[PDB]
Design a protein around this ligand. Structure first.
Ligand SMILES: [Cl-]
Ligand SMILES: [Cl-]
Ligand SMILES: [Zn+2]
Length: 132
């Protein structure tokens, strides 16, 4: 059981509220794949080094056709979000296009962690990959 604890600083990204948090196929598939409807948003962390999902066993969702538009699937890597004593299930998400640096990861969880744990930017958490 090869684990991986990684530390990251809560920051804010762009979060147009993004097709893949917002459309039912994505909803339903995260339900399949991760077993939760993720909260419609992402907690972005700044890591101490670059991060590469490909260096892991990621699920890659399929592209969808939704109301005439095509939508690209997303690479998701499941994780445990470690906030103080509590230790939530979540995933690192990587869509097709992303303007941010490789040292930023996005975390999705079943609820908005920001609010549910009153996090501010600058705060640090640990997350737990259990992969490599
Ligand atoms: Cl954000
Ligand atoms: Cl969040
Ligand atoms: Zn970005």
């Amino acid at each position: 059981v090869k684990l991986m604890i990684i530390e990251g600083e809560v920051v804010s990204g762009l979060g147009e509220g993004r097709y893949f948090l917002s459309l039912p196929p994505y909803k339903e598939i995260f339900k399949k794949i991760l077993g939760f409807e993720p909260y419609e948003g992402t907690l972005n962390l700044k890591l101490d080094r670059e991060f590469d999902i490909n260096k892991f066993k990621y699920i890659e969702t399929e592209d969808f056709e939704f109301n005439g538009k095509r939508f690209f699937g997303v690479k998701v890597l499941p994780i445990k979000i470690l906030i103080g004593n509590k230790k939530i299930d979540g995933a690192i998400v990587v869509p097709k296009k992303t303007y941010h640096s490789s040292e930023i990861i996005e975390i999705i969880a079943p609820m908005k962690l920001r609010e549910q744990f009153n996090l501010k930017d600058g705060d640090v958490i640990k997350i737990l990959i259990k992969g490599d």
